[PDB]
Design an enzyme around this catalytic site. Structure first.
Site, PDB file in Angstrom:
ATOM      1  N   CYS A  17       0.718  -1.066   0.172  1.00 16.26           N
ATOM      2  CA  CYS A  17      -0.075  -0.003  -0.191  1.00 16.26           C
ATOM      3  C   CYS A  17       1.011   1.163   0.031  1.00 16.26           C
ATOM      4  CB  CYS A  17      -0.899  -0.079   1.176  1.00 16.26           C
ATOM      5  SG  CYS A  17      -1.866   1.518   1.579  1.00 16.26           S
TER       6      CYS A  17
ATOM      7  N   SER B 237       0.625   3.725   1.735  1.00 14.10           N
ATOM      8  CA  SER B 237       0.916   4.264   3.093  1.00 14.10           C
ATOM      9  C   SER B 237       2.216   3.395   3.681  1.00 14.10           C
ATOM     10  CB  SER B 237      -0.406   3.541   4.277  1.00 14.10           C
ATOM     11  OG  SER B 237      -1.406   4.675   3.589  1.00 14.10           O
TER      12      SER B 237
ATOM     13  N   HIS C  88       4.882   5.630   2.087  1.00 16.29           N
ATOM     14  CA  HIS C  88       4.898   7.050   3.215  1.00 16.29           C
ATOM     15  C   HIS C  88       5.935   6.742   4.190  1.00 16.29           C
ATOM     16  CE1 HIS C  88       2.178   8.677   0.564  1.00 16.29           C
ATOM     17  NE2 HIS C  88       0.879   8.571   1.317  1.00 16.29           N
TER      18      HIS C  88
ATOM     19  N   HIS D 151       0.777  -3.624   6.601  1.00 14.25           N
ATOM     20  CA  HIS D 151      -0.563  -3.386   7.482  1.00 14.25           C
ATOM     21  C   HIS D 151      -1.768  -4.066   6.866  1.00 14.25           C
ATOM     22  CE1 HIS D 151      -0.360   0.050   4.832  1.00 14.25           C
ATOM     23  NE2 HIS D 151      -1.716   0.211   4.706  1.00 14.25           N
TER      24      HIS D 151
ATOM     25  N   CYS E 282      -7.212  -3.195   3.787  1.00 13.93           N
ATOM     26  CA  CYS E 282      -7.036  -1.765   3.798  1.00 13.93           C
ATOM     27  C   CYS E 282      -7.415  -1.027   2.452  1.00 13.93           C
ATOM     28  CB  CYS E 282      -5.365  -1.529   3.635  1.00 13.93           C
ATOM     29  SG  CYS E 282      -5.081   0.490   3.511  1.00 13.93           S
TER      30      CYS E 282
HETATM   31  N1  NAI Z   1      -7.535   7.278   4.991  1.00 11.88           N
HETATM   32  C1  NAI Z   1      -7.212   5.785   5.172  1.00 11.88           C
HETATM   33  O1  NAI Z   1      -7.611   5.092   5.696  1.00 11.88           O
HETATM   34  C2  NAI Z   1      -6.116   5.315   3.865  1.00 11.88           C
HETATM   35  C3  NAI Z   1      -5.193   6.359   3.291  1.00 11.88           C
HETATM   36  N2  NAI Z   1      -4.511   6.050   2.288  1.00 11.88           N
HETATM   37  C4  NAI Z   1      -3.672   6.918   1.619  1.00 11.88           C
HETATM   38  O2  NAI Z   1      -4.491   7.203   0.178  1.00 11.88           O
HETATM   39  C5  NAI Z   1      -3.786   7.848  -0.813  1.00 11.88           C
HETATM   40  C6  NAI Z   1      -3.886   6.823  -2.166  1.00 11.88           C
HETATM   41  O3  NAI Z   1      -3.370   5.473  -1.658  1.00 11.88           O
HETATM   42  P1  NAI Z   1      -3.115   4.401  -2.846  1.00 11.88           P
HETATM   43  O4  NAI Z   1      -4.439   4.213  -3.800  1.00 11.88           O
HETATM   44  O5  NAI Z   1      -2.594   2.963  -2.286  1.00 11.88           O
HETATM   45  O6  NAI Z   1      -1.848   5.306  -3.508  1.00 11.88           O
HETATM   46  P2  NAI Z   1      -1.319   5.350  -5.072  1.00 11.88           P
HETATM   47  O7  NAI Z   1      -0.060   5.669  -5.093  1.00 11.88           O
HETATM   48  O8  NAI Z   1      -1.446   3.751  -5.652  1.00 11.88           O
HETATM   49  O9  NAI Z   1      -2.410   6.069  -5.898  1.00 11.88           O
HETATM   50  C7  NAI Z   1      -2.260   7.487  -6.110  1.00 11.88           C
HETATM   51  C8  NAI Z   1      -2.849   8.031  -7.407  1.00 11.88           C
HETATM   52  O10 NAI Z   1      -2.540   9.500  -7.290  1.00 11.88           O
HETATM   53  C9  NAI Z   1      -1.926   9.796  -8.560  1.00 11.88           C
HETATM   54  N3  NAI Z   1      -1.218  11.073  -8.479  1.00 11.88           N
HETATM   55  C10 NAI Z   1      -0.316  11.301  -7.744  1.00 11.88           C
HETATM   56  N4  NAI Z   1      -0.187  12.686  -7.824  1.00 11.88           N
HETATM   57  C11 NAI Z   1      -1.215  13.289  -8.385  1.00 11.88           C
HETATM   58  C12 NAI Z   1      -1.725  14.575  -8.628  1.00 11.88           C
HETATM   59  N5  NAI Z   1      -1.147  16.022  -8.294  1.00 11.88           N
HETATM   60  N6  NAI Z   1      -2.597  14.790  -9.403  1.00 11.88           N
HETATM   61  C13 NAI Z   1      -3.533  13.933  -9.843  1.00 11.88           C
HETATM   62  N7  NAI Z   1      -3.134  12.615  -9.385  1.00 11.88           N
HETATM   63  C14 NAI Z   1      -2.047  12.393  -8.829  1.00 11.88           C
HETATM   64  C15 NAI Z   1      -1.084   9.034  -8.971  1.00 11.88           C
HETATM   65  O11 NAI Z   1      -0.687   8.936 -10.360  1.00 11.88           O
HETATM   66  C16 NAI Z   1      -1.639   7.513  -8.306  1.00 11.88           C
HETATM   67  O12 NAI Z   1      -2.173   6.958  -9.411  1.00 11.88           O
HETATM   68  C17 NAI Z   1      -2.138   7.592  -0.004  1.00 11.88           C
HETATM   69  O13 NAI Z   1      -1.971   8.834   0.414  1.00 11.88           O
HETATM   70  C18 NAI Z   1      -2.442   6.643   1.031  1.00 11.88           C
HETATM   71  O14 NAI Z   1      -1.514   6.716   2.053  1.00 11.88           O
HETATM   72  C19 NAI Z   1      -4.624   4.527   1.588  1.00 11.88           C
HETATM   73  C20 NAI Z   1      -5.466   3.483   2.387  1.00 11.88           C
HETATM   74  C21 NAI Z   1      -6.199   3.974   3.728  1.00 11.88           C
HETATM   75  O1  CXF Z   2      -3.116   3.009   4.892  1.00 12.26           O
HETATM   76  C1  CXF Z   2      -3.371   2.554   5.709  1.00 12.26           C
HETATM   77  N1  CXF Z   2      -3.508   3.442   6.980  1.00 12.26           N
HETATM   78  C2  CXF Z   2      -3.493   4.749   6.703  1.00 12.26           C
HETATM   79  C3  CXF Z   2      -4.503   5.626   7.361  1.00 12.26           C
HETATM   80  C4  CXF Z   2      -4.445   6.911   7.360  1.00 12.26           C
HETATM   81  C5  CXF Z   2      -3.268   7.421   7.935  1.00 12.26           C
HETATM   82  C6  CXF Z   2      -1.781   6.577   7.377  1.00 12.26           C
HETATM   83  C7  CXF Z   2      -2.056   5.210   7.698  1.00 12.26           C
HETATM   84 ZN    ZN Z   3      -3.084   1.177   3.681  1.00 13.29          ZN
END
Ligand code: NAI
Ligand code: CXF
Ligand code: ZN
Ligand code: NAI
Ligand code: CXF
Ligand code: ZN
Ligand code: ZN
Ligand code: ZN
EC number: 1.1.1.1
Lengths: 374, 374
Positions: free
Chosen positions: B46, B48, B51, B67, B174
């Protein structure tokens, strides 16, 4: 004897920022199609009117301000169907055109015909009905109630009960409905919840009334002016706190008092810092914070988005979320049936000619609402 | 042959930021009271987790990250009542203690026992079960799935269907649940609405799945990597836009496309600028915007609060708003009943030993989810 004719009357003209209003003769044109000319009976002094004077709320000058009011229809333009001469009416600073995507949406109330987002200071048709010293004068939010007579578009006026006491129900045109609806309609305060209300003026006291009507168990009033606390308790506050009394930031204080954050918080001041503080003091996973106060023109706040990622909800609203033309007559009916009280908000009464003294009372902190009588 | 004993096994240790994972032997202590030791079967890569490598998300180092995973219980400590050796389980990066004010609230899910807000990198008791080269190693979000065996507190594990395919359902830990719940539970997307999804990775594609499941009429995908568009359309996007193709800010483009703003927007990237852009592109009087992406550590965004005063709602959520221990087994059951698909999210399957190659695939833009098999 005045229908179809220009009316010469007295109005309070604001010629430039940070100056007293000038009580002087203006010329009020007769209403065009779908417009309504109103003889004003009472108007309230709201902080948003003062925001025009201070430059906090930017709208074209010179202007006839005033937006919280009630009056009696003097004449109607061609095609008007919803009011008649002699009807008691409340002008609507947020219109209800009934035809735009917002008016048709079940929740929305910020009609796309509003003059707030991109202010022109005109009628819907882009022109003005006011002349002073031979010069055209701008309108304000399509209402302009600081005048013995005004002209409003039909979508910006609601007919109300013929027995209404106009010197009280004018508050339904802004301060009461804004605060009450922010609690009962926008936040949807739940029974037994804990609420925090930042700012204990006319709008904030109305938020407290709404939280109490919703059955909140705790309602914490927050104000830096401790003279506001007694009235806040009378209308439902269970406790009041002055941030200046504490060595810690008030969001920390409120989080401790609520054993982890409040269910609902309201910003009813108009400061960037208290908007962030109010968001912070609601519980991080399920709290809700509602912005009511008007921020200074064009200024951005700064906040950490982790406050939202944990689960908080942040929203704002105009006019308590009420669809204006539908809701104003129903709120007046509820007032007539004693479902809520307006007297606690009215601290001062003055003739319209003493408008500047009424603004002095607001600025000094002494008043909640001054009602001006024409 | 391992119950009650220290296990020596392979894990991927992150000794410091901005370095490859180090695949080497660690020692995993047996579970204490109310703890569960799990043999890992599959774990997802993931964003995250990345990150943590990049310093976007601060947590104590050295650490065993990971996770999003599924495995089989190897042993339980005394007092454990909800899982047994041999059960299939999914670790929960958001716990569900069931006793705190958030767990008792009908809408909250960010249990106060979480290790996100003030990361300690330990078990609930403040200690670690991992050693590497004689040095104690930190846990991550109470899960630490980049290891052949991990130890989790009982409140951070859910028992799932004994027939579940673990190499697929690990995504319920997740990426899928986060995106799906963000649409169907947090935003509560409505039938016929227009949605905009910023970021088309694993979580963003799951938001799209939820918007389609909720009956959205239009789902606009937004990504600067046009290679992501084909899969976004396969799972429900009706159109895709790349901000780099436009001379205007994308919020203005999206507002025009939606004839005044979208009903629901989602930030699924983790950038301050796109959080503000996503808020701005939803309709000003009734739009809803949900933050899903994780922002860079300790950085504030800047925004004009008039975006909220007109009527917009802004919220964020962890794990799609799902109460973790209640929801994970139900989501697995729904998957087994064919109510949603996980295969569209899985682009690569590699042995655990190739973890660094899997992160290279994510960083290059090529992958959605790589599943690592033990
Ligand atoms: N709130 C929660 O519980 C969770 C939060 N997250 C967070 O969600 C976000 C996405 O996670 P994933 O889908 O796994 O990551 P990912 O990296 O696979 O997807 C991110 C997408 O955003 C695109 N992107 C990057 N910069 C951009 C920009 N300026 N404008 C438009 N598109 C852009 C990328 O091309 C990519 O396809 C991450 O920050 C992750 O840490 C992930 C799952 C749990
Ligand atoms: O991606 C899994 N969990 C994330 C949830 C939002 C804060 C960072 C960790
Ligand atoms: Zn995650
Ligand atoms: N969203 C809407 O539709 C409406 C918005 N408003 C705005 O709501 C706000 C409140 O309006 P009123 O109640 O009429 O004004 P008000 O001036 O009577 O009340 C404001 C209160 O905030 C207190 N205060 C000032 N600074 C403070 C601080 N740092 N911390 C704590 N308390 C502080 C003041 O002592 C005062 O009692 C104004 O900004 C007004 O323009 C008012 C009605 C309609
Ligand atoms: O006070 C009445 N109207 C206000 C509503 C919020 C923006 C400025 C005008
Ligand atoms: Zn309208
Ligand atoms: Zn007002
Ligand atoms: Zn809990």
């Amino acid at each position: 004897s005045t229908a179809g004719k220009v009316i010469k009357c007295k109005a309070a003209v604001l010629w430039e920022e940070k100056k007293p209003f000038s009580i002087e003769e203006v010329e009020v044109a007769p209403p065009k199609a779908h417009e309504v000319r109103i003889k004003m009976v009472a108007t309230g002094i709201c902080r948003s009117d003062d925001h025009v004077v201070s430059g906090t709320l930017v709208t074209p000058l010179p202007v006839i301000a005033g937006h919280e009011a009630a009056g009696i229809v003097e004449s109607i333009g061609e095609g008007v169907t919803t009011v008649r001469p002699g009807d008691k009416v409340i002008p609507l600073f947020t219109p209800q055109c009934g035809k735009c995507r917002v008016c048709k949406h079940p929740e929305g109330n910020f009609c796309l015909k509003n003059d707030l987002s991109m202010p022109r200071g005109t009628m819907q048709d882009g022109t003005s009905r006011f002349t002073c010293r031979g010069k055209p004068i701008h309108h304000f939010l399509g209402t302009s109630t600081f005048s013995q007579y005004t002209v409003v578009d039909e979508i910006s006026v609601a007919k109300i009960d013929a027995a209404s006491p106009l010197e009280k129900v004018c508050l339904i045109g802004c301060g009461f409905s804004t605060g009450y609806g922010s609690a009962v309609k926008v936040a949807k305060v739940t029974q037994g919840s804990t609420c925090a209300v930042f700012g204990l003026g006319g709008a904030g006291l109305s938020v407290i009334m709404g939280c109490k009507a919703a059955g909140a168990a705790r309602i914490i009033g927050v104000d830096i002016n401790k003279d506001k606390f007694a009235k806040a308790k009378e209308v439902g506050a269970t406790e009041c706190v002055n941030p200046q009394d504490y060595k810690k930031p008030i969001q920390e204080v409120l989080t401790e008092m609520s054993n982890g954050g409040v269910d609902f918080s309201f910003e009813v001041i108009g400061r960037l810092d208290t908007m962030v503080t109010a968001l912070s003091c609601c519980q991080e996973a399920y709290g809700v914070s509602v912005i009511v106060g008007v921020p200074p023109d064009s200024q951005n706040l700064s906040m950490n988005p982790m406050l939202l990622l944990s689960g908080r909800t942040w929203k704002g609203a105009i006019f308590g979320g009420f669809k204006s033309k539908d809701s104003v007559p129903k709120l007046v009916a509820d007032f007539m049936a004693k479902k809520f009280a307006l007297d606690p908000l009215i601290t001062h009464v003055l003739p319209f000619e003493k408008i500047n003294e009424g603004f002095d009372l607001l600025r000094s902190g002494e008043s909640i609402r001054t009602i001006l009588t024409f």
